[PDB]
Amino acid sequence: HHHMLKAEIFSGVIPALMTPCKPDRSPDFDALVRKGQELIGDGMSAVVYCGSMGDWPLLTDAQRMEGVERLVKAGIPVIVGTGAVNTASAVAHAAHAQKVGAKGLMVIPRVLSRGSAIAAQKAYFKAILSAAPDLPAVIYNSPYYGFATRADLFFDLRAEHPNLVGFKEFGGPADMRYAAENITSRDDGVSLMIGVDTAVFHGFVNCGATGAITGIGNVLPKEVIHLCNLSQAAALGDVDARQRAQELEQALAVLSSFDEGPDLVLYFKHMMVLKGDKEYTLHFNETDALSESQRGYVETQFRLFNTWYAEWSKLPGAVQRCKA
Amino acid sequence: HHHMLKAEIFSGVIPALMTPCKPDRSPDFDALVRKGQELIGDGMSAVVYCGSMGDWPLLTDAQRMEGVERLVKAGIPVIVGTGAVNTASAVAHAAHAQKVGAKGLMVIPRVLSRGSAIAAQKAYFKAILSAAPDLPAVIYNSPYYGFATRADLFFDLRAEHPNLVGFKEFGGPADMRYAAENITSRDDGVSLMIGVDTAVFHGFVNCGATGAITGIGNVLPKEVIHLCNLSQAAALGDVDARQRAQELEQALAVLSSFDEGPDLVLYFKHMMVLKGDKEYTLHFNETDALSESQRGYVETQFRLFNTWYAEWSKLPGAVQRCKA
Amino acid sequence: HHHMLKAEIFSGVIPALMTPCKPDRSPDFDALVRKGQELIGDGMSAVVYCGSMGDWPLLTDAQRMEGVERLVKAGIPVIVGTGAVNTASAVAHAAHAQKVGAKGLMVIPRVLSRGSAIAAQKAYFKAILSAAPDLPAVIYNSPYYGFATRADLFFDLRAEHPNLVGFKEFGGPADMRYAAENITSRDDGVSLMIGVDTAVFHGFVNCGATGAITGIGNVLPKEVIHLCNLSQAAALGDVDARQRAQELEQALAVLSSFDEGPDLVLYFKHMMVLKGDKEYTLHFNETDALSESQRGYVETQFRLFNTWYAEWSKLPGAVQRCKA
Amino acid sequence: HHHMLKAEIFSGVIPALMTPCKPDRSPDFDALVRKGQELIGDGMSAVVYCGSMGDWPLLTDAQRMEGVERLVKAGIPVIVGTGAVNTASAVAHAAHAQKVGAKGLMVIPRVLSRGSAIAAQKAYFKAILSAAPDLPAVIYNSPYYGFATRADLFFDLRAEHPNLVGFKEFGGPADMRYAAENITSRDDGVSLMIGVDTAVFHGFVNCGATGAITGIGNVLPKEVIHLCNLSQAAALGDVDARQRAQELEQALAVLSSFDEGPDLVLYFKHMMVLKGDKEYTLHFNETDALSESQRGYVETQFRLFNTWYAEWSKLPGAVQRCKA
Amino acid sequence: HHHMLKAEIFSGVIPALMTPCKPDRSPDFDALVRKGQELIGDGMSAVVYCGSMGDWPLLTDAQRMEGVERLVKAGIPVIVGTGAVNTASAVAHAAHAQKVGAKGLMVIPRVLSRGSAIAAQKAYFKAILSAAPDLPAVIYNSPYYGFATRADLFFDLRAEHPNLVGFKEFGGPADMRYAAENITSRDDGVSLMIGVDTAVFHGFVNCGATGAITGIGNVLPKEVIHLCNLSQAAALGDVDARQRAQELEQALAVLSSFDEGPDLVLYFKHMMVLKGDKEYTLHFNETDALSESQRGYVETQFRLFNTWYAEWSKLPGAVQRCKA
Amino acid sequence: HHHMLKAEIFSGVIPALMTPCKPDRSPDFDALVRKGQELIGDGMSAVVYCGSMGDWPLLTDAQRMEGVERLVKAGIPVIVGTGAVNTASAVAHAAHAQKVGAKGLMVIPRVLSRGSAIAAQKAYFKAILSAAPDLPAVIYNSPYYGFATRADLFFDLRAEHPNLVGFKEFGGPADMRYAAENITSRDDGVSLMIGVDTAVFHGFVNCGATGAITGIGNVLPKEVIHLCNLSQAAALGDVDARQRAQELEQALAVLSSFDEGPDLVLYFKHMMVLKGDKEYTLHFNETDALSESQRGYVETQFRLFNTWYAEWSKLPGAVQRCKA
């Protein structure tokens, strides 16, 4: 029985990048790289590409791999998303990640064909893990797939695939607790990663999370790093940070809750536009757009949060200590 | 595409009035008018009559209309409740509201006959709206009716009935969020109204509500206005009010939660009696009364809240700024 | 401990009558009486008036009582529906039933005010039962009311109100079984009544029901009596009837299932029109009507059932023995 | 208001074809065409390609279109499946269907990106319908997508897209009834199609279905046509067929129920192998295979059904009249 | 990979015996043995003692073991129930079963302490299986325990404990199908046992069951054997038996459904009394008794079933062929 | 109608004691008494023995009674747990409690035999209460039993059994509110007891609880007394305590939540070991142990809470006023 360091690539704050559109609605890879570099410069530790935030279903496999290569060539630590329509595609993403020197793998379950069958999932995960043996890997778990990776399966996979060192949960606080209690609190180098924007405090403080993959953090990087830092200080036992982390998470809650729904890319791209990044204006599908009411709601809530934060962020104590 | 002012009648804090009984268990209209005048004097903006709080099912249509006329003649801004056993009655309430110069209409869904049929509801709402074309109207939405008014129906009604300018939700925070995101955050003068006592902070801060119809506010008007003011200041981005509004809402939560259940009129009338308004002693039905345990519970919780509030309400800062 | 005969008024097949409209959309009482007389002549044992099938919420209390008096004066055994917006109305229906010599009382729970409170229901049932002490009474039980009358309450009511001798269940086969096991299979003269059109076989054979209140039986009286007779012969142990009752119930199932939904009066009145009773054309509300697709569906299913029945009803054995 | 003939392409019995593998696990188009021709020769009216039964997610868009072209060139009436990872792909399938002269379009909802958003679905369906204006189209509806096409949306689409003439339901008997009552029983040429193998009798007799898309029918074409014929004769009012259709559906129920689950292609391809079609041995994914217990179960149930059918199919009357 | 015969002890029809009371409410072991011998003489293959039907929680461990020894000494094949308050007791039952020469073991999950923990269940099952290595063993699976034994656990246990050769399901038709598909249809000698009285046809015909443990069969042995024989003939492909088995199961359904509920021993002991076995009059607890209504219901349903059966059982064909 | 003092034995903070093991895995009664004395010395008011925390199912009745006698002889106020496999055992525990001079009775519902039958529960509770007429008694209520004691049953029992003076709820905040509103807020000396570790603030402040039975309090007595004192001061109306009680409850929430699950004794005994009480190392079952991940999780959360508390507990105001 062994004690091992957790994988550095799954620590800290990690945006799942959006893919900006050129005016012709093809990917603007230059703008992708610029945003990635900017977010690392703001204090992010790595990025995830191409995930749901990156519009993976709307892009070809070649386009995703080009985006991955461009990010890696720029010196950005990349965790590669393996979401796919089939095993061959998922494997290809993983093989390409290892080939080009990405630093991590996000292993996404099988969809559309045998989605609920646990035997199918086991084989699919093994195929993906086998294709990038040298890359630390995190498995995504969500009720969306009609199945759950439990401890038995996780440890069976890990016994055959030593690169499986992480677990990322979308499915709610109770599911994250299940993971912390039964999977990720061994001695042995396995990390729980926060996998939805609304679960940051719960993940770091109540579940021993090592890192957070963020949607809203693409828009509000300094504020999301601030929350993550406060939450990590709270996990050390700090009194002041534990209060402050909760205040900030609650103020962020509406804008973070867009990460939970179908329109996450619509909402987050519109927020990028609101803060002056016009390249986030168009979507890959010509008719994908927020409604008039949805745009008004997000604009109102964006303004509210920015106003609150402008004053709250001046408070002495943990608020200052934990800034990015 | 237009920007328009929200209807003033659906702004601020608005009690849904109880109908006091005379000793013979007929309505005491004089006492109704006195309470209405008092609550406006305390800082309420309008009243709702005759709603569920007013015991509408227990009163004749003529009695409700008499109460409405008496309130209007006294100079009180009245939003008229159209709850009814049938379309003809609901229409009559609406027509009477317009005739006598009430300022708003609360449009209540069809019950008892075709309650779950959305085609029935659409026609019923159109009949009611058509009967008071000059009065701003709010539609009530609750899971109790076995159906939900969604954005499609709301906007279809509004296209034919320009007086439909409001939406009032009973069904929980998620339903209120649905309404804010998809219905009430357009540019065009439509208001979300808080429609249950426990949802005040969530409505104003997270959902952009313009006003609150209140049950507990009949009993604790100054305290409920205080909460609404704090919540509205929080919606401006204030740090201190956002903390204080939540403290007050939590202290009020038990007494507000009676608004959620079948015995709301029993509980609220007994609270009116506790604060010295003896005309709230009797109910229209001779056997409707709280149990011994229910009376003890409410008395204990009333005393608790009053004790807490007496000291908390002296705190400096937003607490003082936002008093009625 | 006693053995007593079940109340004759709650035996056999009992239509819950529709209220036909005159062209001005007021009740056609003459047509009501003609239909009642016709259905008794077809083999029905009694009628229920004014129930949900009779559009009670759309009619005034005076109109319902006029319909009741007219039926009673014609010599028809009447079970009076006490559905009401309030206790005073429900009591008035019951008092009027006893005054005019109706033969039974259908006791309907409280709605709109304190609907889910069991203390309210107990008091409401006692008020109604007390108002017609001389009339055998059946309590209606349905999940629609947000509460269930269980054995404890039923027997407590019966101890104070000896006229409570029946139980009518809308809520599904399991609820009917609960009633048979725990309420209606004592020695003591209490009857289970089938209370939804789709539960006839289950009620008579599996639950020991004594009678059936029917919606579809207004339209297809001979066929519904045939099913009830077959089911009762099956309850004697007959082999052939037990097979045949199930075949007929299954063939009737679509048309019977309209009794389960909000549009029951729409569907059943349209079926009355299809068989040539034009006085069932209009509804009390001008806009209540089946859609084009709903009319097509019912017409197709009506024709199907009539075609099947025309041949099936010629079969030898229990089919012939059990005809009305 | 108009009466119009239902589209012939959506009548009768229609297998959703499996894509056989060559030994190299690429599609065997020759074997696909041979099976299609054989099934039409057995009595099937049309085929669906490439649906879930055809392993669409595992095949490239070019491969699906090649299969479609090969079937069409062979003279087989083809309904084209538009299942896709994105709008551009779904549109391409539809455009290709129209280009090559397929006879119908199966319109499959959006997945993976905005799957639950009804605004997204509406736009997606319009894009697909617009791409093949000349082809009769059926929309698939299933709870799997996190949304339901109701009558409002269906009729809104149909008003702009006259080729939308069909509705196919996976979601259970109640959902099929909803469709029959509210969508497909107008006068106007719209067809309900049975969309899961276990719902044949319910669709034809209780819901007025015009045709059935079948999985198990690829394996047992004569037996599935027999059931469909019996069910259609039952829908005419036949007594004997109504009994026999139900006996056959019940005997077929286990083998049909595999159509409901994730392993449908595994189970049905293994059944094809059992009846001597070795080209159905391999799957596109090397590790997709039934377990030892699953193979034993299906083999046992296949043998059972064949034994029962061998004798039952000799019975006189409707059994003989309704054979393929 | 191996083919092996299923264990004979888990084939056929097997009553779970009631423990009759002496007048002092201690067990009447003499009467227990007499009933066991009688039921084997009627055609039962084995018995289960002491299960829930045997009132295990009400008896001491020593009493259960005495009953087991007495049955075994009489020459009756006994499957021993290991239900227990703790591991030590469950192990003791198993060890005693092996010591005295019982023929099988019914392995019952852990309760009261760590009931929902799957790690606890695994260890508990291993402890029980290890204590009787020479006895074929069946694991009971029910939602009552807050957990389910799936294929993974079953096969893991079986790999370490070769005596685990059976699976018994209480939890409904879908759970029994899961077991047939994934656990019990391998080549390798594992048996599915019907474990609730209402699932006989479904188990034998749809799920490949080898045997049935019965409650109602203690009361109606010849009739339950008749149903089991008909169901087994139906599983061979017989047409007539498949019809008849379903008719008999449906006629038996009410009396069988008592096996599903908390009062099973109350209902079944009262039925034993009705057929003249007075030693089934008393229960171990002085106040455990059916209510007046429950006794009336069961008496009515017992009489109904006996009357139906008396005539139905004379029918020619499979009815005669399959009698005990 | 009377006002009466609540029973002192059900006031304050009351650990449900663990039973430590000797190395041979028999109970260490000496260590049990030492811990009981220590916890009373820390500020606890009484103890509960032998409850679920005490491993009751794993111990003989004689062992539990020995533990009870030893605690009572030591001068510790004991509330005796009556959890049992049958009525005779439960009665024996109660009779023994009264015989030896325990101060209270915890009345636990019937399990394993007729668990869901309310008639069985009523009789079982009466048997237990009758056996210790002189001891104040609290009934435990939990969804785990498949039934709920409501006000009707509680007051019926209390009318026949004047020693029934308490109610203890496991089932969640809404169930505790139901109890406060309808059972425990009469004038008449009935106490609500907090019955799960996570419900302390809600019980004292929102529900008028008089005492708390605690699991985590065995490990963290001073901290749990601190929370209870703060919560009781909050129930007086204190502003500062109401804030502080909630901060402490939230910091304690993870460690308290182990009380909600199957592994409560595993988690709490391991925490006792962590604070240096080695006699809590072994469990009665040799294989009952936390997993590696569960041990890591609890150790991390224990350390976190202790670190936070070390600093938070120095704060001025209510924090200091309310220390044990």
Domain extent listing, chain D:
1-324
* CB B79, CB B14: distance < 8 Å: yes
What is the nearest CA distance from E297 to chain C, expressed in angstroms? 5
What are the strands, taking DSSP E only, across chain D?
12-15, 47-49, 78-81, 104-107, 137-141, 164-169, 191-194, 211-214
At the second CATH level, the architecture of C1-324 is Alpha-Beta Barrel (3.20)
Q: Which of B168, B178, B267, B269 is catalytic?
A: B168
| Encoded amino acid at E17, one letter | L
For chain F, list the contacting chains (3+ Cβ pairs, <8 Å).
A, B, E
Secondary structure string (H, E, C) spanning chain E: CCCCCCCHHHCEEEEECCCCECCCCCECHHHHHHHHHHHHHHCCCCEEECCHHHCHHHCCHHHHHHHHHHHHHCCCCEEEECCCCCHHHHHHHHHHHHHHCCCEEEECCCCCCCCCCHHHHHHHHHHHHHHCCCCCEEEEECHHHCCCCCHHHHHHHHHHCCCEEEEEECCCHHHHHHHHHHCCCCCCCCEEEECCHHHHHHHHHHCCCCEEEECHHHCCHHHHHHHHHHHHHHHCCCHHHHHHHHHHHHHCHHHHHHHHCCCHHHHHHHHHHHCCCHHHCCCCCCCCCCCHHHHHHHHHHHHHHHHHHHHHCCCCCHHHHCCC
- Experimental method used, please? X-ray
The three-point CA angle F134-F136-F139 to 5° equals 130
Enumerate residues 6+ apart whose C-beta is below 8 A from B4: B187, B188, B189
Rounded distance between C-alpha atoms, residue C138 and residue C102, angstroms:
14
- Are C202 and C180 in contact, with CB atoms under 8 Å apart? no
Alpha helices in chain F (DSSP H): 29-42, 61-73, 87-100, 118-131, 151-160, 173-182, 200-201, 221-235, 239-251, 253-257, 264-274, 292-312, 318-321
* Cα–Cα distance, F76 to C200 (Å, whole number): 64
How far apart, in whole angstroms, are the C-alpha atoms of residue C205 and residue C128?
31
Angle at E275 between CA E269 and CA E276, to 5 degrees: 90
Resolution number, Å: 1.8
Instruction: Name C64's Cβ contacts closer than 8 Å, sequence gap at least 6.
Output: C49, C50, C54, C56, C81, C93
d(CA F176, CA E171): 31
Are the beta carbons of B9 and B102 closer than 8 angstroms?
no
What residue type is assigned to position F32 of the chain?
L
Q: Which of F185, F205, F242 sits opposite B293 (nearest CB)?
A: F185
F-facing residues of E in 42-61 (CB < 8 A) are 52, 55, 57-58
Which of E246, E304, E307, E319 to probe by mutation at the C interface, max C CB count within 10 Å? Answer: E304
Among residues E1, E11, E8, which one has the least CA distance to residue E229? E11
Tokens of E90: 């469950």
In degrees and rounded to multiples of 5, residue E188 shows phi and psi of -105, 15
| CA–CA separation, C116 and C136 (whole Å) | 26
Q: Cα dist. C316→C8, C42, C241, C311, D311 in Å?
A: 31, 22, 11, 11, 27
E213 annotated as a binding-site residue = yes
* Partner chains of B (3+ C-beta pairs under 8 Å): A, C, F
Work out whether the CA dihedral F210, F216, F220, F223 comes out positive or negative: negative
Q: Which residues are within 8 A (CB) of E174 and not within 5 positions of it... i.e. 6 or more apart?
A: none
Q: Is C180 on the interface with E (CB under 8 A)?
A: yes
- For chain C, report the end-to-end CA distance as a whole number of angstroms: 37
Contact A185 F312 (CB under 8 A): no
Residue type, C85: V
Task: Indicate the residue type of D93.
Answer: H
CA pair distance E134, E128, nearest whole angstrom: 12
Classify residue C6 by its DSSP letter: P
Q: How far is CA E145 from CA E17, E82, E116, in A?
A: 22, 15, 7
Q: Do chains B and E touch (3 or more CB pairs under 8 A)?
A: no
Q: Which of B261, B257, B149, B276 is nearest to B198 (CA)?
A: B257
Interchain contact, D307 vs E185, CB within 8 Å? no
Nearest to E13 by CA among E79, E61, E94: E79
* Nearest chain A Cα distance for residue D77, angstroms: 26
What one-character-per-residue DSSP string does A14-77 give? EEB---PBPTTSSB-HHHHHHHHHHHHHHT---EEESSGGGTGGGS-HHHHHHHHHHHHHTT--
**Chain F contact set for B308 (CB, 8 A):** 237-239, 242
Active-site hit among C49, C103, C124, C140? C140
- What burial letters (b/e) apply to F249-272, b meaning 16+ CB within 10 Å? bebbebbbbbbeebbbbbbbbbbb
Spatial distance between the Cα atoms of E208 and E194, rounded to a whole number of angstroms: 10
Token pair, residue D248, equals 């056959």
Which B residues, 263 through 292, put their C-beta within 8 Å of a C-beta on chain F? Answer: 291-292
Question: C20: Cβ–Cβ under 8 A, 6 or more apart, which residues?
Answer: C27, C28, C31, C32, C35, C277, C279, C280
Closest C-alpha among F298, F292, F314 to residue F256: F298
Q: State how far the Cα of D182 lies from the Cα of D196, in Å rounded to an integer.
A: 20
- With beta carbons under 8 A apart, name residues in chain E contacting D261: none
Sequence-ordered strand ranges (E) for B203-313: 211-214
Asked if C114 and B291 come within 8 Å (Cβ–Cβ), the reply is: no
| CA proximity to C54, closest of C283, C279, C292 | C283
- CA angle A168/A169/A175 to nearest 5° reads 140
CA distances from B105 to B148, B163, B214 (A): 19, 9, 16
Q: Closest CB to A123: pick one of D123, D263, D287.
A: D287
Whether D contacts F, i.e. 3 or more CB pairs less than 8 A apart, is no
Q: Chain D partners of E210 at a C-beta cutoff of 8 Å?
A: none
Phi-psi category of A119—alpha, beta or left, where left has phi over 0 and alpha has psi -120 to 50?
A: alpha
Give the tokens for residue E201.
């046809």
d(CA A250, CA A174): 19
Asked if the Cβ–Cβ distance from C308 to D181 is below 8 Å, we say no
Task: Let me know: does A145 contact A118? Beta carbons within 8 Å.
Answer: no
Compute how many other C-beta atoms are within 10 angstroms of the C-beta atom of residue B3.
Answer: 8
The C-alpha atoms of residue E257 and residue E245 are separated, in whole angstroms, by 17
Cα–Cα distance measured from residue A88 to residue C24, given in angstroms and rounded to the nearest whole number: 71
Chain B residue whose CA is closest to A296: B185
Q: How crowded is the C-beta side of A270, counted as CA atoms within 13 Å?
A: 20
**Residue position matching structure tokens 């055809």:** D54
Rounded CA-CA distance F48/F70 in Å is 13
Judged by a CB distance cut-off of 8 A, whether residue D118 touches chain A is no
Rg, chain E, Cα only: 19
Between CA F59 and CA A177 the distance in angstroms is 31
Q: Do D285 and A86 count as a contact with CB atoms less than 8 A apart? A: yes
Give the three-class secondary structure for D121: helix
Question: What Cα–Cα distance (Å) separates residue A150 from each residue in A123, C97, C125, D2?
Answer: 15, 65, 53, 57
* The token pair that represents E81 in the structure block: 């129930």
As given in the structure block, the two tokens for residue B151 are 């954005």
CB pairs under 8 A between A and B: 44
Q: Tell me if F288 and E114 make a contact (CB, 8 A cut-off).
A: yes
Q: Å from E182 to nearest chain F CA?
A: 28
- In the numeric block, which tokens belong to residue B241? 């009010």
> F324 with F43: CB under 8 angstroms?
yes
Please count the other Cβ atoms lying within 10 Å of the Cβ belonging to residue D23.
9
- Using an 8 Å CB-CB cutoff, list chain C residues near B291: 119
CB contact under 8 A, F185 and B251: no
> How far is residue C53's CA from residue C49's CA, in Å, rounded to a whole number?
8
Token digits for A179?
Answer: 């993971």
- C-alpha closest to that of B81 among B58, B70, B65: B65
Element (H, E) at A193: strand A191-194
Among residues B121, B66, B52, B130, the alpha carbon closest in space to that of B98 is found at: B130
**Residue D211 is which amino acid?**
G
DSSP B225: H
Q: Is A194 helix (H, G, I), strand (E, B) or coil?
A: strand
Rg (CA), chain B: 19
**Quick check: B285 and B37 in contact, CB under 8 A?**
no
Is B3 near chain A, with CB under 8 Å? Answer: no
Is E120 in contact with F57 (Cβ distance < 8 A)?
Answer: no
Q: List helix spans (H) across F169-212.
A: 173-182, 200-201
Distance CA B244, CA B235 (A): 13
For residue B305, the Cα-to-chain-centroid distance in whole angstroms is: 22
By three-state DSSP, how is residue F84 classified?
coil
In eight-state DSSP terms, residue D5 is P
Distance from CA of A63 to the nearest CA of D (A): 15
**Min distance C262 CA to chain E CA atoms (Å):** 31
Burial of F4 (0-12, 13-18, 19+ CB in 10 A): exposed
* CB-CB contact of D180 with C300 (8 Å): no
Annotated catalytic residue, options F124, F140, F267, F280: F140
The gap from C-alpha A112 to its chain's centroid, in whole angstroms, comes to 22
Inter-chain CB pairs, C–D, below 8 Å: 44
Burial of F53 from C-beta contacts in 10 A (0-12 / 13-18 / 19+): buried
Name the token pair of B144.
């109790």
- Give me D141's structure tokens: 């509806």
CA distance D263 to E177: 14
Q: What burial letters (b/e) apply to A80-106, b meaning 16+ CB within 10 Å?
A: bbbbbbbbebbbbbbebbbebebbbbb
How many angstroms separate the Cα of B300 from the Cα of each of B267, F237, F315?
A: 13, 11, 30
Enumerate the β-bridge partners of residue E204: none
Distance from the C288 Cα atom to the nearest Cα atom in chain B, whole angstroms:
7
Partner chains of A (3+ C-beta pairs under 8 Å) = B, D, F
Q: Does E127 touch chain F (CB under 8 A)?
A: yes
Active site residue E168: yes
